[PDB]
Amino acid sequence: VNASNPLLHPHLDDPSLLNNPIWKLQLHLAAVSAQSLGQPNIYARQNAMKKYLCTKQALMEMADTLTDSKTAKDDQLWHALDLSNLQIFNISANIFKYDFLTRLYLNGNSLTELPAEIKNLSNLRVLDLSHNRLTSLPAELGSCFQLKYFYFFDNMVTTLPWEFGNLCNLQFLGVEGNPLEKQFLKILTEKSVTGLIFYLRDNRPEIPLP
Amino acid sequence: VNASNPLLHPHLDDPSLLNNPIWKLQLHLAAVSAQSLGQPNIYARQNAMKKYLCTKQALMEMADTLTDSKTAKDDQLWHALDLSNLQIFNISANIFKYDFLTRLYLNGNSLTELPAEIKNLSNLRVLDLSHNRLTSLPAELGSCFQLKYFYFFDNMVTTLPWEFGNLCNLQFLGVEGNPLEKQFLKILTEKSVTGLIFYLRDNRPEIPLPHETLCQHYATPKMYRYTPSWALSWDYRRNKLKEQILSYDSDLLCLQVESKTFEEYWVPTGIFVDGCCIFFLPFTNFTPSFTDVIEVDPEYVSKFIGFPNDKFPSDHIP
Amino acid sequence: QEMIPLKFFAVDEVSCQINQEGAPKDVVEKVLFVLNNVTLANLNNKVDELKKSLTPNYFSWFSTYLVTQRAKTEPNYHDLYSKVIVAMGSGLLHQFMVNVTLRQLFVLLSTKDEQAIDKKHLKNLASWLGCITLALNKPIKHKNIAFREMLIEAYKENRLEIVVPFVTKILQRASESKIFKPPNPWTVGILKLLIELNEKANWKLSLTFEVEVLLKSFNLTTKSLKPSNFINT
Amino acid sequence: QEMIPLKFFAVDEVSCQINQEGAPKDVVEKVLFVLNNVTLANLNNKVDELKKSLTPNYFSWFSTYLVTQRAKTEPNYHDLYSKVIVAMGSGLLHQFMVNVTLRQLFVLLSTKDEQAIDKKHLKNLASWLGCITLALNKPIKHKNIAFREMLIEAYKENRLEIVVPFVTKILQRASESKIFKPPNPWTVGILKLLIELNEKANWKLSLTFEVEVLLKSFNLTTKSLKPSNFINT
Amino acid sequence: PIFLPPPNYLFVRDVWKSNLYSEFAVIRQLVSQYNHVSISTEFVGTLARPIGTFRSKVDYHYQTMRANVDFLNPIQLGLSLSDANGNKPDNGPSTWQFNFEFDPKKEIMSTESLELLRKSGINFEKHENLGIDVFEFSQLLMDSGLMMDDSVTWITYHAAYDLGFLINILMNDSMPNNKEDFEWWVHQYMPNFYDLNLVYKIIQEFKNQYSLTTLADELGLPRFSIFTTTGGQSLLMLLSFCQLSKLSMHKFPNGTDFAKYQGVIYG
Amino acid sequence: PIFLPPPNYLFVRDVWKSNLYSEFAVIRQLVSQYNHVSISTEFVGTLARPIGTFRSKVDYHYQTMRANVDFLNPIQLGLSLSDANGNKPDNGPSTWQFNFEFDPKKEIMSTESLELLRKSGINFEKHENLGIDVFEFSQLLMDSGLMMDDSVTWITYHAAYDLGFLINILMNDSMPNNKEDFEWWVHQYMPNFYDLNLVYKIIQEFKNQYSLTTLADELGLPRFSIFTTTGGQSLLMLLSFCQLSKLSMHKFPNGTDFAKYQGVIYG
């Protein structure tokens, strides 16, 4: 009964946001994410196949952002950590000690918090929080600037913490859907992602020195 | 009440054996004995002092007998064992495995018995059972024939085993005093010791059998003293050799023999002062000197220290 | 060949930090020269040289050679070789010798197919073990070989035909030992079990002959000692 | 001097059957020649020769010399001598070295009168122990020295002034060890107890300086780790 | 062929915070004489997967293991000592099961595998309150005399993870980038060890799954409930390895020593 | 100075016919690691005295002892093992008291010392029925690995008789004529041993009775009831010897080793 909830999905209430290319995207990718469920470490498996021959909604986010904008015109080595879909209430502080990670899928768990340490993940590029119990997101997720794709689909999330759009390079912030405050929603539609990020960059409240 | 008891020392009755040098020596030596009580290992102490320069009972014996004589005219080593006056109600047979022992003092303990293995002690010369609890003495103490002095005083001993006087060499035997049957006491008073020893040797009771060569000059009593004097005499041994030879019907008799008794006795045929004649195992030879060969029931040969004896008129056999 | 576990026989490691090597051509040479030219008389000297050639790091090798190459097949020379070992005066070298002997012995005794074991080598090796242990007034530790137990086990496994010669060939060396010859309560306990088997076993007559030869070496007969109670039947 | 029992320090025997002798004039000669003429560069060869002169039967001696004659008084050369030992490649020789060092150390640490113990030799010897053990990625067994325990014991005995340098001189070698340097939970547990003492002890300032130098060698300060709970007060 | 180890051999001792130090004393004592030690561990195995490049299937196996040892904590660890012939002290426990402090609420777990593990016989309450602190543990294990000694022989079955956790506990640091360093550390910390799973593989492969229980069954051992516990597990792999090494005199059918595969991991 | 051995150290195990073999197994196991063994015995000491010659007071002492060992049987014998530092296994009994088969009625005794011995705590019924058979005993002790090994170190206090009985039991023959042979046997059967009574004498004689309980008191040990038993006796003399040898590094005040008086009897 959370799929039919207009707070979570605003095109239930619109109705037609569905002819907004922006929400068309959102509901799309969000559908792909929703599809991912039930298999542990989906991404890793999908990369098994992809390497061999396989959705990989990071890759579908890529396809869709390209088609969206085309029609609108020794060792170091492995970089991505797949913790997806092991219904897991908690996250090891050690994962943050891996600073070389550019990817990190946390999606499909019970995580109710995201550790502040996320900030030492600064080389981060994709991040996936979807289908968890997050009720809010770390500022100092803001320190993560190199982020391109960021997904928390399905959480209960009211707000973005200013900070990001401290993150400039973000191409897609998937929000559909958690109970967004509608001010960010209204910006996300009409300004898209980069627009939302810019409202945040620009209007963050002050802060003094001592 | 025992020190004054008549039934113990019968000389409170006489009243005087105190004249009789026999029960005189019984009294002097019995008192030298009952003196030594109370101190652990006397003989070893005494011998401490002796070796240095409290006399001895063995030595008091030797003297008193010597006066009765005056007036009648790397190692091997230590031989004596002292268990005296540490009041012992038992003995491990182990002491008897010590056969070099010629002395063995057991006096002043609680011994209520003497283990028969004593007989394994054969070189024994002194023996002291004085002041123990002994009810009676073992047989087979008689296999101890080399005994010179042997004391058991204060004990309750009624009868002597026979067996001894199987013991020839015994000079002193202290009996004073134990409620003896008084007849042994009788032979002892005035026949002395060997009076009694011989008494025993010569009347033992009959000693039977289950079942199945000494020329007389060589048969001298001095040599075989365990054989009751009559059995030793040639009158007996002729008859025996006869019944022996006749029962055994052997077609060739090699006789191992005085010449005279061959041409008188044996002739009623065959052929030949001494000699050897002819007509037509555990031991061959049984004596305390050497029991060897150069089989008869061995439970029989026990309870004898040698031959010839009541039924076998030579130290040899067929 | 299929192996079976052995309950009462075991070998331990030798405890040393000294790293064991094989030997180079020249060491092997000097050593086999010494071993081949040795007589009872020259022993002390020959060995004095051997000591210069053969260093502790080589012990583990020497042993393995001498046992498997010589001792195993050449009984006559046991005494001699024994006297060589003793002459070296190394407890470690001795440890090694016994260790090897024990292992080879283990192999034979744990072979599952009786007919597959060469009994000439079994006998030679048991005699060798005895020769460097009991005959030297040194014990065989219970943890290495537990005889009475091993015998009873063999009786319940119908393995008596491999074990009995093995035991009797080892024990037959106790007669050179002031310490282990009867009435050494150990030696004797064993003897009494062997006598008890030589009645109650109904085993083949070769075995009886063996128990008899062993008892012979002590100047005793199967009549000498009361058999024990260990074989219930 | 009167000795006291030591709860947490103990030396075991070396386990070998090899009979240890002193050395005759010529062995001592060859050996001291090698030891005196050795430089870091010639080491491998010089030692190659030493190996020909010094046989295992002599180890027990070499050790007792090298520790008491050299290592005890000549800290500079610890590294060098360490490298010599390592070069020999004998576990037995090493066993012996540690054994000696441990004994001498035992004597010092059990001396009842504090002023009676030469702390230059205590320090030199602790540094030597560390140098042939921790710094080599080999452990000091708990049965030999139990540090945390020994420290607490020292605090209850007012012996902290002999023990603390002893510990810190040994540990200070852990910084040459990929294995024993922090955060090796062992090294660190000790550090934390030392830090806890450096507050709660109210001990003399020489000690504090020692805890601080040790912590220095790891690039830490008394601020680096939370002290432990072991000192109740 | 029936293999029935003496009854005392089968006794496994639970170690908690409460009894840690005493048991470690006992261990410290026995290690000299009983120089063969076997190790087993128990954790969620809820593996995170690494993605990206690596190198052959081994760099991938190692990478996965690394990531997991880093993200996970072992619930239990079994240890078993015996002599080289597989004898154990006729007196006292020769096999320990150490229960670490583990809070389901604070650690990675899935009610799935939480319940699977409660069925396994883990009592998470006890582990929560009475559980051993792994710092203390690592510390006792350091100077105990099991580690860093050619004298001791370590025994493991399919060791990649078990050795991973062990080495991780001893290092008190993040596992290394690469298999190579991890191996430097393994060989430093445990200079003599065997993977029973690999020796058995090799053996079964003359005459040509490899599950320890198979090796156990072929060796003659009954299946005693005790063998399913983590401690029990170390026990079983030790009994098995000793028996097997006795029978073959640690020689393969072809006459080369087990010692060839000393130091060799996986299986 | 207070010396308080760990509690398990103070445990003495009664051995009877019933449990002889098991205990001997344990012993057989421990001997490798715990190589110091101490011996005590208990008998009537009812001594018979030999008379005749001999040679110096030693040939007399020897002769008396010989005679007595021959004529007497030991009622009890204590044994105790520990490592050279005096450590014992934290698990299981490290001290045994063997009770031999002894029939008052069949053996040398005086109701005097019978009653003195009952007060001592000897139960003659148990010894009569359940008593160890000394043939069995001697046999187990032979191959156990305590005898005839330089590795093991024997500890005794005022040893003449104790060593006499022991050597007598091992020989299964009558004790020799002379001290000299007896000594050849002692040194063969026990190549490394000390008389604590003599080491202590010598020590007390710098700074210049010697009863073990004095050594014990000076050493710091409380007087525990257990120490009065025969087994307890072996225990005490072992604890004492080990402590004393630790303190002095087995060196006399003058710097010569205890090893000088190794092999040396009496006191």
CB contact under 8 A, E52 and A43: no
Cβ–Cβ under 8 Å, residues B18 and B27: yes
> In this complex, is the C-beta atom of E64 within 8 Å of any C-beta atom belonging to chain A?
no
For residue F160, give the 3-state DSSP assignment: helix
Q: Which is it for the CA torsion D134, D135, D138, D144, positive or negative?
A: negative
CB atoms within 10 A of CB D32: 13
Residue B243 and residue B186 in one domain: no
Cis peptide before C183 (omega within 30 of 0): yes
**Spatial separation of the C-alpha atoms in residues C101 and D4, rounded to whole Å:** 48
Residues contacting E109, CB < 8 A, separation 6+ = A88, A89, A90, E44, E46
Pairing of strands E153-156, E193-195: parallel
Residues contacting C128, CB < 8 A, separation 6+ = C67, C71, C72, C75, C78, C101
**Residue E77 belongs to what domain range?**
1-267
Cβ–Cβ under 8 Å, residues C233 and C200: yes
F162 marked among binding-site residues:
yes
Q: Which amino acid is it at B58? A: A
What residue ranges in chain C does DSSP mark as E strands? none
For residue E39, give the 3-state DSSP assignment: strand
> In this complex, is the C-beta atom of D186 within 8 Å of any C-beta atom belonging to chain E?
yes
The total number of structural domains that make up chain A: 1
- Give backbone dihedrals phi and psi of F108, rounded to 5 degrees, phi first: -75, 120
Of the residues D12, D18, D99, the best mutation for testing chain F's interface (the one with the most F CB atoms within 10 Å of its CB) is: D12
DSSP calls for B131-151: TS--SS--SSGGGGTT-SEEE
The alpha helices in chain F, defined as continuous H runs, are 20-30, 57-71, 111-120, 124-129, 134-143, 160-171, 179-189, 196-204, 212-219, 230-247
**Token reading at B229:** 């004097």
> In this complex, is the C-beta atom of D73 within 8 Å of any C-beta atom belonging to chain E?
no
**Spatial separation of the C-alpha atoms in residues E62 and C6, rounded to whole Å:** 41
Q: Which residue in the block uniquely carries the two structure tokens 């502790």? A: C56
The total number of structural domains that make up chain D: 1
A179 burial level (CB within 10 Å; 0-12, 13-18, 19+): middle
Last residue of a domain, one of B203, B223, B244: B203
**Spatial separation of the C-alpha atoms in residues E166 and E159, rounded to whole Å:** 10
Cβ–Cβ under 8 Å, residues D34 and D65: no
Cβ–Cβ under 8 Å, residues D221 and D213: no
Q: Which of D48, D45, D50 is nearest to D30 (CA)?
A: D50
- Give backbone dihedrals phi and psi of F132, rounded to 5 degrees, phi first: -60, 145
- Give backbone dihedrals phi and psi of D70, rounded to 5 degrees, phi first: -110, -70
The CA distance from D129 to the nearest CA of chain F, in Å, is 20
Residues contacting D62, CB < 8 A, separation 6+ = D23, D31, D54, D93, D96
Helix crossing, C91-110 with C160-171: angle to 10°?
160
Cβ–Cβ under 8 Å, residues D150 and D9: yes
DSSP calls for B250-310: -SSEEE---HHHIIIII---EE-----EEE----SB--SS--B-----HHHHTT-SSSSBT
For residue F12, give the 3-state DSSP assignment: strand
Half-sphere exposure of E110 (CA within 13 A, CB side): 15
Helix crossing, E134-143 with D185-200: angle to 10°?
110
**Spatial separation of the C-alpha atoms in residues E14 and E11, rounded to whole Å:** 10
Largest CA distance in chain F: 53
- The beta-carbon neighbor of D141 closest among E140, E145, E188 is E145
Cβ–Cβ under 8 Å, residues E51 and A43: yes
CB atoms within 10 A of CB C114: 11
Q: Is residue B42 part of a domain?
A: yes
Q: Which residue in the block uniquely carries the two structure tokens 């180079």? A: C24
Q: Please tell me which chains touch E, using 3 or more CB pairs under 8 Å as the contact test.
A: A, C, D, F
CB contact under 8 A, F142 and C184: yes
Last residue of a domain, one of B203, B225, B242: B203
Q: Is residue A195 part of a domain?
A: yes
Residue B71 and residue B164 in one domain: yes
- The beta-carbon neighbor of F145 closest among C142, C183, C189 is C142
> In this complex, is the C-beta atom of C185 within 8 Å of any C-beta atom belonging to chain F?
yes
Residues contacting B291, CB < 8 A, separation 6+ = B282, B283, B285, B306
- The beta-carbon neighbor of E29 closest among F26, F89, F93 is F89
- The beta-carbon neighbor of E54 closest among A78, A83, A88 is A78
Print burial letters for C187-225: b (CB count within 10 Å at least 16), e (below 16).
bbbbbbbbbbbbeebebeeebbebbbebbebbebeeeeb
**Spatial separation of the C-alpha atoms in residues C41 and C50, rounded to whole Å:** 15
DSSP calls for D68-137: IIIITT-GGGHHHHHHHHHHHT-HHHHHHHHHHHHHHHHHHHHBS-GGGS-HHHHHHHHHHHHHHTGGGT
- The beta-carbon neighbor of E90 closest among F25, F33, F90 is F25
CB contact under 8 A, B44 and F51: yes
User: Given its phi and psi angles, is residue C125 left (phi above 0), alpha (psi -120 to 50 degrees) or beta?
Assistant: alpha
> In this complex, is the C-beta atom of C52 within 8 Å of any C-beta atom belonging to chain D?
no
Q: Which CATH number belongs to the domain containing residue B249 in this structure?
A: 3.30.1370.190
> In this complex, is the C-beta atom of E135 within 8 Å of any C-beta atom belonging to chain D?
yes
DSSP secondary-structure letter at E48? P
The CA distance from E184 to the nearest CA of chain D, in Å, is 11
Q: Which is it for the CA torsion B230, B234, B237, B242, positive or negative?
A: negative
**Spatial separation of the C-alpha atoms in residues A185 and A181, rounded to whole Å:** 7
**Residue A120 belongs to what domain range?**
1-73+79-204
Q: Which is it for the CA torsion F3, F8, F9, F15, positive or negative?
A: positive
Q: Which CATH number belongs to the domain containing residue F150 in this structure?
A: 3.30.420.10
Q: Which of A144, A80, A152 is nearest to A112 (CA)?
A: A152
F173 marked among binding-site residues:
no
- Do D and B touch, counting CB pairs below 8 Å (3 needed)? no
Cβ–Cβ under 8 Å, residues B144 and B103: no
Please calculate the CA angle E121-E236-E43 and round it to the nearest 5 degrees.
40
**Spatial separation of the C-alpha atoms in residues D110 and B221, rounded to whole Å:** 87
Cβ–Cβ under 8 Å, residues C127 and C75: yes
**Spatial separation of the C-alpha atoms in residues D229 and A65, rounded to whole Å:** 58
What's the alpha-carbon Rg for chain F, to the nearest Å?
18
From the centroid of its chain, how far is CA D141? 12
Of the residues B57, B98, B107, the best mutation for testing chain F's interface (the one with the most F CB atoms within 10 Å of its CB) is: B98
Cβ–Cβ under 8 Å, residues E124 and E72: no
Cis peptide before B308 (omega within 30 of 0): yes
Cis peptide before A177 (omega within 30 of 0): yes
Q: Which residues pair with C111 in a beta bridge?
A: C3
Q: Please tell me which chains touch C, using 3 or more CB pairs under 8 Å as the contact test.
A: D, E, F
Q: Which of C92, C95, C100 is nearest to C72 (CA)?
A: C100
> In this complex, is the C-beta atom of D7 within 8 Å of any C-beta atom belonging to chain E?
no
Q: Which residue in the block uniquely carries the two structure tokens 């004689």? A: F205
- Give backbone dihedrals phi and psi of F124, rounded to 5 degrees, phi first: -75, -20
Could you tell me the end-to-end alpha-carbon distance of chain D, in angstroms, rounded to an integer? 33
User: Given its phi and psi angles, is residue D15 left (phi above 0), alpha (psi -120 to 50 degrees) or beta?
Assistant: beta
**Spatial separation of the C-alpha atoms in residues F170 and E123, rounded to whole Å:** 56
CB contact under 8 A, D146 and E143: yes
**Residue C59 belongs to what domain range?**
1-233
The CA distance from D58 to the nearest CA of chain E, in Å, is 23
The CA distance from E225 to the nearest CA of chain A, in Å, is 30
Give chain A's count of helices (H) and strands (E): 4, 4
**Spatial separation of the C-alpha atoms in residues B229 and D38, rounded to whole Å:** 104
Long-range contacts of A114-121 (CB under 8 A, 24+ apart): A114/A138, A114/A141, A115/A91, A116/A140, A117/A93, A118/A144, A119/A143, A119/A144, A120/A96, A121/A96
Residues contacting D15, CB < 8 A, separation 6+ = C15, C16
F42 marked among binding-site residues:
yes
Residues contacting F214, CB < 8 A, separation 6+ = none
> In this complex, is the C-beta atom of C19 within 8 Å of any C-beta atom belonging to chain D?
yes
Q: Which CATH number belongs to the domain containing residue B292 in this structure?
A: 4.10.60.20
CA distances for A103 relative to A38, A95, A123, A165, B123, angstroms: 20, 12, 9, 19, 109
For residue C4, give the 3-state DSSP assignment: coil
The CA distance from F139 to the nearest CA of chain C, in Å, is 5
DSSP calls for F80-147: EEE-TTS---SSS-SEEEEEB---GGGS---HHHHHHHHHHT--HHHHHHTPBPHHHHHHHHHHSSSS
- Give backbone dihedrals phi and psi of B164, rounded to 5 degrees, phi first: -50, 135
> In this complex, is the C-beta atom of E114 within 8 Å of any C-beta atom belonging to chain A?
no
**Spatial separation of the C-alpha atoms in residues A17 and F95, rounded to whole Å:** 90
**Spatial separation of the C-alpha atoms in residues E42 and F24, rounded to whole Å:** 39
A73 burial level (CB within 10 Å; 0-12, 13-18, 19+): exposed
Q: Which is it for the CA torsion F249, F253, F257, F261, positive or negative?
A: negative
Print burial letters for D99-133: b (CB count within 10 Å at least 16), e (below 16).
bbbbebbbebbbbeeeeebebebbbbbbbbbbbbb
Helix crossing, F160-171 with F179-189: angle to 10°?
70
Experimentally determined by: X-ray
Report CA dihedral (A103, A109, A113, A114) to the nearest 10 degrees: -10
Give the strands of the sheet with F95-99, arranged side by side: F12-15, F95-99, F76-82, F36-42, F153-156, F193-195
Residue B126 and residue B219 in one domain: no
Cβ–Cβ under 8 Å, residues C224 and C215: yes
Cβ–Cβ under 8 Å, residues E66 and E182: yes
Print burial letters for A91-121: b (CB count within 10 Å at least 16), e (below 16).
bbebbbebeebbbbbbbbbebeebbeebbbb
CB contact under 8 A, D184 and E147: no
Q: Which amino acid is it at F87? A: N
CB contact under 8 A, D18 and C55: no
- The beta-carbon neighbor of D139 closest among E140, E147, E171 is E147
**Spatial separation of the C-alpha atoms in residues E239 and E216, rounded to whole Å:** 9
Residues contacting F127, CB < 8 A, separation 6+ = F75, F99, F100, F101, F102, F103
Q: Which CATH number belongs to the domain containing residue C79 in this structure?
A: 1.25.40.180
Q: Which of E18, E143, C164 is nearest to D171 (CA)?
A: E143
Give the strands of the sheet with A172-174, arranged side by side: A126-128, A149-151, A172-174
The CA distance from A48 to the nearest CA of chain E, in Å, is 9
For residue E97, give the 3-state DSSP assignment: strand
Tell me the chain C residues in contact with residue D17 when contact means C-beta distances shorter than 8 Å. 16, 90-92, 94-95
- The beta-carbon neighbor of D184 closest among E28, E144, E172 is E172
The total number of structural domains that make up chain F: 1
